[PDB]
Design a protein around this motif. Structure first.
Motif, short mmCIF file in Angstrom:
data_model
loop_
_atom_site.label_atom_id
_atom_site.label_comp_id
_atom_site.label_asym_id
_atom_site.label_seq_id
_atom_site.Cartn_x
_atom_site.Cartn_y
_atom_site.Cartn_z
N UNK A 81 0.82 -1.21 0.00
CA UNK A 81 0.00 0.00 0.00
C UNK A 81 0.86 1.26 0.00
N UNK A 82 1.92 1.28 0.81
CA UNK A 82 2.79 2.46 0.84
C UNK A 82 3.40 2.72 -0.53
N UNK A 83 3.92 1.67 -1.18
CA UNK A 83 4.51 1.84 -2.50
C UNK A 83 3.47 2.35 -3.50
N UNK A 84 2.30 1.70 -3.54
CA UNK A 84 1.26 2.12 -4.47
C UNK A 84 0.85 3.57 -4.22
N UNK A 85 0.68 3.94 -2.94
CA UNK A 85 0.32 5.31 -2.61
C UNK A 85 1.39 6.29 -3.09
N UNK A 86 2.66 5.93 -2.92
CA UNK A 86 3.74 6.82 -3.32
C UNK A 86 3.83 6.94 -4.84
N UNK A 87 3.67 5.82 -5.55
CA UNK A 87 3.77 5.86 -7.01
C UNK A 87 2.64 6.67 -7.64
N UNK A 88 1.44 6.64 -7.04
CA UNK A 88 0.34 7.43 -7.59
C UNK A 88 0.56 8.91 -7.33
N UNK A 89 1.13 9.25 -6.17
CA UNK A 89 1.43 10.64 -5.87
C UNK A 89 2.44 11.21 -6.86
N UNK A 90 3.38 10.39 -7.33
CA UNK A 90 4.37 10.81 -8.31
C UNK A 90 3.93 10.51 -9.74
N UNK A 91 2.66 10.17 -9.94
CA UNK A 91 2.13 9.93 -11.27
C UNK A 91 2.94 8.93 -12.07
N UNK A 92 3.62 8.02 -11.38
CA UNK A 92 4.42 7.00 -12.03
C UNK A 92 3.63 5.71 -12.22
N UNK A 93 4.00 4.96 -13.25
CA UNK A 93 3.34 3.69 -13.53
C UNK A 93 3.45 2.75 -12.33
N UNK A 94 2.46 1.87 -12.19
CA UNK A 94 2.43 0.94 -11.08
C UNK A 94 3.02 -0.40 -11.50
N UNK A 95 3.96 -0.95 -10.73
CA UNK A 95 4.50 -2.27 -11.07
C UNK A 95 3.64 -3.39 -10.52
N UNK A 134 -6.49 -6.83 0.17
CA UNK A 134 -6.78 -6.00 -1.00
C UNK A 134 -5.80 -6.19 -2.15
N UNK A 135 -4.70 -6.92 -1.94
CA UNK A 135 -3.76 -7.16 -3.02
C UNK A 135 -3.74 -8.63 -3.39
#
Ligand SMILES: CN(C)c1ncnc2nc[nH]c12
Ligand SMILES: [Ca+2]
Length: 430
Positions: free
Chosen positions: A53-67, A178-179
């Motif tokens: 969740x932390x990684x996904x939250x951070x990647x969305x904040x930086x508008x970066x693609x999700x792995x 959730x994952x």
């Protein structure tokens, strides 16, 4: 073959490891922690979910693609090991040194961890510990972003190296993660923790599907309350009132509430016993709170939900008086029981706010609340078989004072236990 697995021995340590002491507290902890045992799977899955969740939250904040964001579990019988790997944010050497997780030592003779932070230009690190006064850290190559935990189970817990035993554990505890969660390359979870969704987004078909699952019923819910709050405590909950009338088992059920207790979408106790007052045992649903240990000081949550559920029913009576009338007819017994069983006056008055009676001023068949009677006074009641008998009872004829009319002997005993409402004493005509 739709088998999807990511766990493999890709890591390697070039140099030697450095030895570190465990803090005074931690050393005591690892001994107490290693004294059922299966909950460690719950804890590790929950930790992996948070990391993702932390990684996904951070990647969305930086508008970066999700792995790929997944949780993988592996069992190896030959090696007597259980492994959990997530592709989350990972840990740096600093976080790894400081480092729920120690629940692994409940069953582990030694723990082996590999972690690599998701930050760019990060290095992999190896963390080793046998649960004694020393752990080892070393730089490792071939460490995938996220975290890998390899538990070498002690001989007394080799069962957790069997896929059948672990599958039963995962399904029971981590059904709503959730994952995507995999066990030996096989997808496990498919249920959605709809109580975490935005209340206005949940569709009627989801509430009905979830109600039948939690209540193990085939009917639909006549009432649905999606309650989310973080002020007093963290609460993500849904409560259902069955469409059916209460059953002999519901009225006589002892030591059950038919409400599931969860923490971060992970099960704590199925059929939680003390989450709701016993008079609210006809409620079906789920309560999710991160402020749960993992059994004494829960009462604060019980009282909050009682007030919220009482408010919900008061509002339901105002929104649809006819639907609430049949609800009162079907479940009024629980409310009278709740008043008779209450010990403090403020709770008795709150529950009594849900009670309905007939009045001499209103026509036969029309209901009224104790507050509506108190509003119209310029509290007197009479319990009789029915309305006509009440109007003809000698007690009633004896000043333009309106009197409430009860029909059941429990109604009288209920009003007898409820001595007063809003500082107005209850006095029987006869
Ligand atoms: C155990 N712990 C504090 C963790 N920190 C960060 N990412 C993790 N992924 C799995 N466990 C993790
Ligand atoms: Ca569902």
């Amino acid at each position: 073959e739709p088998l999807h697995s990511i766990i493999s021995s890709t890591e390697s340590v070039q140099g030697s490891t450095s030895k570190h002491e465990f803090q005074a507290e931690t050393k005591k902890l690892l001994d107490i922690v290693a004294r059922e045992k299966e909950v460690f799977i719950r804890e590790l899955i929950s930790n992996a979910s948070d990391a993702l969740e932390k990684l996904r939250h951070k990647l969305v904040s930086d508008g970066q693609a999700l792995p790929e964001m997944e949780i993988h579990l592996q069992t190896n019988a030959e090696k007597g090991t259980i492994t959990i790997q997530d592709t989350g944010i990972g840990m740096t050497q600093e976080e790894l040194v400081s480092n729920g997780f120690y629940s692994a030592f409940m069953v582990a003779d030694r723990v082996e961890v590999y972690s690599r932070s998701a930050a760019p230009g990060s290095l992999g690190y190896q963390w080793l510990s046998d649960g004694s006064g020393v752990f080892e850290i070393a730089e490792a190559s071939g460490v995938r972003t996220g975290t890998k935990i390899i538990i070498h189970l002690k001989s007394d817990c080799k069962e957790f190296s069997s896929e059948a035993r672990v599958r039963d554990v995962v399904t029971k505890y981590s059904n709503f993660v959730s994952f995507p969660l995999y066990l030996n390359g096989r997808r496990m979870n498919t249920l959605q923790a709809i109580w975490m969704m935005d209340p206005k987004d949940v569709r009627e078909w989801q509430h009905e599907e979830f109600y039948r699952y939690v209540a193990q019923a085939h009917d639909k819910p006549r009432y649905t309350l999606h309650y989310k709050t973080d002020a007093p405590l963290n609460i993500r909950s849904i409560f259902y009132v069955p469409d059916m009338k209460p059953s002999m088992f519901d009225v006589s059920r002892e030591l059950g509430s038919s409400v599931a207790l969860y923490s971060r979408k992970v099960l704590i106790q199925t059929k939680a016993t003390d989450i709701l007052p016993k008079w609210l045992r006809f409620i079906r649903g789920v309560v999710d709170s991160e402020d749960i240990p993992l059994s004494a000081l829960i009462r604060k949550l019980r009282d909050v939900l009682q007030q919220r559920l009482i408010k919900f029913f008061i509002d339901q009576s105002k929104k649809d008086a006819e639907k609430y009338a049949k609800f009162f007819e079907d479940y009024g017994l629980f409310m009278r029981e709740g008043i008779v069983t209450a010990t403090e006056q403020e709770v008795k008055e709150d529950i009594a706010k849900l009670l309905r009676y007939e009045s001499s001023a209103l026509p036969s068949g029309q209901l009224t609340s104790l507050s509506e009677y108190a509003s119209r006074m310029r509290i007197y009641y009479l319990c009789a078989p029915n309305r006509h008998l009440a109007e003809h009872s000698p007690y009633y004829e004896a000043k333009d004072t309106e009197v409430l009319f009860c029909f059941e002997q429990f109604d009288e005993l209920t009003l007898l236990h409820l001595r007063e409402f809003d500082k107005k004493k209850l006095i029987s005509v006869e």
